[PDB]
Symmetry: C3
Subunit: 430 residues, 3 copies
């Protein structure tokens, strides 16, 4: 833990130094450096560099102005290396990629990507890290959802290093499934010589199972580079303090941070705030109920957000742009989890699925129909398993949210309970 906190704090420190350096090169004010659109452009440059450029926004003469600068790719690479104490440091790079992936996840639905690959467009929750490149980092591999892995594999199905890349990806997906039966199917997908339709069909099946028997997907709170640099500049030593991507650290950092965004005339700044908050804590596919309780204000479904994407296209004019503070804080914090919830065990149940009438009174007599009726090789075993599962089944027993004053996470608050972010659109009301 101390050693993990050490190396994590080391990469965040590197990103920080880089960002400050990059902010001096462009002679940006501290406020301008803390504009999310400027941070993304800087982030994109160091990612693309591994000439390059993008739009950079300045507060000139009372109005927001856009400049499209350029840098030699060799120069950026040198700047990144030297901010990371000589080392090539690919970890900090993929950390900024996962941040970008989390924002993509929160902003865009990729139904067009899903349909081309023959997948159901209702597989959002499975699609964490879909915009993330194939053969990403180890952290990138961990952060990718089950569906992302299924999608990547079908693209493979549609030069014997192709074989190892196919088997590596099969194993990534396998390590994510929490039931042996799901894992055993992945073996049958992997053990195939010349994979094709049977494997394709198997992978579509596995993705569906992962909507109920959910896979183990990592979640890492990853913040815009401006947040880390800002902290480094202000006198915070991530190497001496350590740092965590799943503990209290990122919540505490945002609590001591102020990020800005360019805002269009039609846009609600609070709705922009929610979007970037969601992205920051990898919460695009979380239950809106828990996201809300944690944040302390309602986390509204995508379709009821009066906001477009963070990035301002070159198409639109800057004279109508204003700049707003992004509200990225929270009432509570909570540990980010690798788990997909309970899928295994099924040790008893303990509950009530019907009533026995005591009083002679006119009413309906409620009962849990799907559960009662439920009780009436590896493919059918999975069917039987997800037929047993209930939406009412509780996961993460005993685990709760925490006060921001609760550094060591000593006193869990268990919340007494609209769930789908991408559930509210012109085709479907979920």
């Amino acid at each position: 833990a101390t050693e993990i906190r050490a190396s994590v704090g080391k990469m965040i420190d590197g990103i920080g130094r880089f960002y400050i350096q990059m902010c001096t090169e462009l002679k940006l004010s501290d406020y301008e450096g803390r504009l999310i659109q400027n941070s993304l452009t800087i982030e994109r440059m160091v990612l693309s560099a591994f000439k390059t450029g993008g739009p950079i926004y300045r507060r000139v003469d009372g109005k927001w102005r856009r400049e499209l600068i350029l840098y030699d790719k060799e120069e950026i690479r040198r700047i990144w290396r030297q901010a990371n104490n000589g080392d090539d440091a690919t970890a900090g790079l993929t950390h900024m990629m996962i941040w970008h992936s989390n924002l993509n996840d929160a902003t865009y639905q990729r139904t067009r990507a899903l349909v081309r690959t023959g997948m159901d467009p209702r597989m959002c929750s499975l699609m964490q890290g879909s915009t993330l490149p194939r053969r990403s980092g180890a952290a990138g591999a961990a952060v990718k959802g089950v569906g992302t892995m299924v999608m990547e594999l079908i693209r493979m199905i549609k030069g014997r290093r192709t074989r190892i890349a196919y088997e590596r990806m099969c194993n990534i997906l396998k390590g994510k499934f929490q039931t042996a039966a799901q894992r055993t199917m992945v073996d049958q997908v992997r053990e195939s010589r010349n994979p094709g339709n049977a494997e394709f069909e198997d992978l579509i099946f596995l993705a569906r199972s992962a909507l109920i028997l959910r896979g183990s997907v990592a979640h890492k709170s990853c913040l815009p580079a401006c947040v880390y640099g800002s902290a480094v500049a202000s006198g915070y030593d991530f190497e001496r303090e350590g740092y965590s991507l799943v503990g209290i650290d990122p919540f505490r950092l945002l609590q001591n941070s102020q990020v800005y965004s360019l805002i269009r005339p039609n846009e609600n700044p609070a709705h922009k705030s929610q979007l970037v908050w969601m992205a920051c804590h990898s919460a695009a596919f979380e239950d809106l109920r828990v996201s809300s309780f944690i944040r302390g204000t309602k986390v509204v479904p995508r379709g009821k957000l009066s906001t477009r994407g963070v990035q301002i296209a070159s198409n639109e004019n800057m004279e109508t742009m204003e700049s707003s503070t992004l509200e990225l804080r929270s009432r509570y914090w909570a540990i980010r989890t690798r788990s997909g919830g309970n899928t295994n065990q099924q040790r008893a149940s303990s509950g009530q699925i019907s009533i026995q009438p005591t009083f002679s009174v006119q009413r309906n007599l409620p009962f849990d129909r799907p559960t009662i009726m439920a009780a009436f090789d590896m493919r059918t075993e999975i069917i039987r398993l997800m037929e047993s599962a209930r939406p009412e089944d509780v996961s993460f027993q005993g685990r709760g949210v925490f006060e921001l004053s609760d550094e060591k996470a000593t006193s869990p608050i268990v919340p007494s309970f609209g769930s789908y972010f991408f559930g509210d659109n012109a085709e479907e009301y979920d």
Copy 2:
């Protein structure tokens, strides 16, 4: 459109002239002419005439009095013809029939009619126009629901002009189904020589499918004759203005109209108002949610309405009757539709049917069970089709309600969302 508005306006004008003429013959005051019970009796007379009579109510000496008048059937027919500029005009007749059908639909459940025909009494929504005679008008044919058509066909199943009447009715029903598979079954019902049990069974199946893959049924706002006559009298020329049964016209007319009803001692006049409002806009089987949003006050389920039927039986005494204004106006208007909603295409989906846990917190992990589990000749094709459908699926995309000031329907209001009128009774809580 101009030509449709022309001929519609022509028939409504005819009904109007007729009603005014009929109101002079009986020497009724304008208020008395605008009593819904008097209008129905006049409507019934001209329908029956194609001796006849019914109860007519007058305000005599501070109390409501009932008289049972009679007219020669030849005389009524002459009055109807001459109000319709010579022409026999059967259109205006069936328009008053559809008005009556709409009121029946709103007032009475016909479960006894359904059970005799071997149909499920939960097929309300399918039963628009059931009290309407077989071999009605073309408008009457259009207005009839899928179940009505199924019921009429089973009565046929239970003189070779019997064959053409059987095939005509099969084709009516066919033109109402929006999926080819449903249509293809109707062909198999029609192509049968000596129809019997197989056809009966097929028709019961088709009616069930029409609860999910809903048929295209016309909806026409049809008002008591007193409303048209009142408008004609007051100086509105339906021939010069044109008129529509599905556009803004009937809403606008009711906005400029005042209709009365006789009200029993136990009755809430607002609940009477809702009933006749529903009937007026053919809304008996509409989602109560949309009916409400349109009207602007709650449209309550049948079983929670403190009201009996509009018509006062000869059995009951007039000395306890009062007269109340019927509130038949609306906050908004909306176009009446022929469509049964989306049944076809199924081009992708776009939505979210599960969550992926981000935070280690105690909760249930929601998922859309029926949808996820769903994926695990013409009869089974239909089964497969309605198994794909979801209650959450959106129809009439982009289409919305309108302000009464919005004549041309330029600015649609899309409403941000108890659905069943006949769902709340002593046997069932829906």
Copy 3:
């Protein structure tokens, strides 16, 4: 009815006299006699006696003190007999047993008991009288739920008087099922020579059916002995007045009664009050909705009650105990029923399970999916029967709750409608 009221009033009178006598022997104050923990100890003594003892609590010097007294079993038996006018009176004994069973039902889940017997722990509602001994009283037999009977039979399955006891119990269970098909299966369980796995499997099946096609289980309001004794002492003659276990009597008695409970530091006295109220009226497995409407304050699920059991273990110290009034009254009363609700007939339906769109507006088009899709030897007959049933189906038509002033139950109040008491726990949110 008069004769039933006679003998019931006779046994309650007996329990009363006994309790008063028992209260004098211990020289308890009237307040102390009306402490629920003292009443249970006295109740337990007369039950165990058919040396014996238990904890008795006194108000000594401003603090609550515990004494563990002992009595010769012969002496208690003599006291019970002589309070019941010579007669051995086993009825009053089983009445106090059913009271204990009702409290157990309300306090403890017996999932551990269920899993050992191979039953689903979600069968709470079926488990009325599970803590009640096998071969109880006739009243005890009547009060036992379907699952209790199934559990008792499997324990038999796991000395030819074993055969008669097996067949007697089969018949008890049979008389509880309201459908012939369920009854016919019990015949097949009973007609078995050397019962085993097939019978075990059949009994698990029958219990599941009883969650939807619910069995006829008696419900008897049974009160702590202190309530009866208190009434006898104060000048109420149950023999002259008669008494009922299912009519208004027990509600009226509690309305004129004051019972106390020892309360732990962490405990909410209102939540203790609910628990003992539930037990009193055999309402552990009732719909919380009806329990609430009757009582007039919310009847909260088990898991949201800030209270442990009524009985204070010898382990814990008395110096932190306080004494609180138990609120055991009710806004309304309602007749306790033998019925399991409608399971038979299925004469038509009358309802609405879909809508037909009238207005061109954007929305989802709701429909009752499970009901519509439903329509697409004795084991499958039962499957078919419970597949027809709907949670929305109404039982006890016309029957309602009553004002406490309504002795003769003349004016039923039909309530316009969280259902499961044991539905809200760390594994399941129901």
